[PDB]
Design a protein around this nucleic acid. Structure first.
Ligand code: CL
Ligand code: NA
Ligand code: NA
Length: 314
DNA sequence: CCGACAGCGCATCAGC
DNA sequence: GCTGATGCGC
DNA sequence: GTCGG
């Protein structure tokens, strides 16, 4: 239908983010690509697309050029540009953002090979990103995610049977594949070394293989199923018990669902973030956080019917 | 016209 | 050494 | 880049 248009917008988005360092223009192009990707008709003109929310005058003009010529002069030039294409590519390395990519390209470091012969110029995260470059770009089939969940739930309970661990993200919504694994962790003793002991055990059984970052509340690293399976990205967050289910709700998503749930909350007189759900006074003064002991409690606070994660796509 | 567009944990830099 | 800023990812 | 105050 409009794959040519959405690919064009996505490509424009990446270059704004990675090369121009214009994050808001990146998101504008992404939003336009998303709304067009859902549009159930083949677009015949920029004017037609303009009617959609997120598509404005500039994108309408670009669509008109694309429909009449089959390309975008601006994009064609960008693709051919050595500096811009190299910067854009380097950002595919985890740990390499627009700033590092620009600095690397400035000094003639443009390829994965260039990165390999300049390890001294890479920080720990970037070296890991380089090491697992191909693996990190692979999807994870649900069956592997289940096997990964089996290991995590098993080892967590082995450390302390009172831990509560939930694998969230699109996986919890029943997705057939995932980009990574996002684990939410809590314990009755923690409210508003618990994380360390879990990471340590996962390393002990050789599930966790590398560490990108690690503090008292957040771990970001690499894992791998026993055999060879690709190495996978895994995050683990330690959340206070009284904020756990607000966290589970938020990190389960989806993004559109969270947006819809916050809107309904306000219309019912509540504000919902990833941490707490709080009532609003007659002027807008937010009160103390409300007690939450399940996902359903959040729904019951705003007079909503409990939606299964499976149905939380929108 | 012009400000918002999410906010925060961790690693590391910049400055004192 | 320290504090605050920045880069990065999510 | 787009939206909306
Ligand atoms: Cl709060
Ligand atoms: Na529009
Ligand atoms: Na990157």
């Amino acid at each position: 239908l409009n794959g040519g248009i959405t690919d064009m917008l996505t490509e424009l988005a990446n270059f704004e983010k990675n090369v121009s360092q214009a994050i808001h223009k990146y998101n504008a192009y992404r939003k336009a690509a998303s709304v067009i990707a859902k549009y159930p008709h083949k677009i015949k003109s920029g004017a037609e697309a303009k009617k959609l929310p997120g598509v404005g005058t500039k994108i309408a003009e670009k669509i008109d050029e694309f429909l009449a010529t089959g390309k975008l002069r601006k994009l064609e030039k960008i693709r051919q540009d050595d500096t811009s294409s190299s910067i854009n590519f380097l950002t595919r390395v985890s740990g390499i953002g627009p700033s590092a990519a620009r600095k690397f390209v400035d000094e003639g470091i443009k390829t994965l090979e260039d990165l390999r012969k300049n390890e001294d110029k890479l920080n720990h995260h970037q070296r890991i990103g380089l090491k697992y470059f191909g693996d990190f770009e692979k999807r994870i089939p649900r069956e592997e995610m289940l096997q990964m969940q089996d290991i995590v739930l098993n080892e967590v309970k082995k450390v302390d049977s009172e831990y509560i661990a939930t694998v969230c993200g699109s996986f919890r919504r029943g997705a057939e594949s995932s980009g990574d694994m996002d684990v939410l962790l809590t314990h009755p003793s923690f409210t508003s070394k618990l994380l360390h002991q879990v990471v340590e055990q996962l390393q002990k059984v050789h599930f966790i293989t590398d560490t990108l970052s690690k503090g008292e509340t957040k771990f970001m690293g690499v894992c791998q199923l026993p055999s060879e399976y690709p190495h996978r990205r895994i995050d683990i967050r330690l959340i206070p018990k009284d904020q756990y289910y607000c966290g589970v709700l938020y990190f389960t998503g989806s993004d559109i669902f969270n947006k819809n749930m916050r809107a309904h909350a306000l219309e019912k007189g509540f504000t919902i973030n990833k941490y707490t759900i709080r009532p609003l006074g007659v002027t807008g003064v937010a009160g103390e956080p409300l007690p939450v002991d399940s996902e359903k409690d959040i729904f019951d606070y705003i007079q909503w019917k409990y939606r299964e994660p499976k149905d939380r796509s929108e």
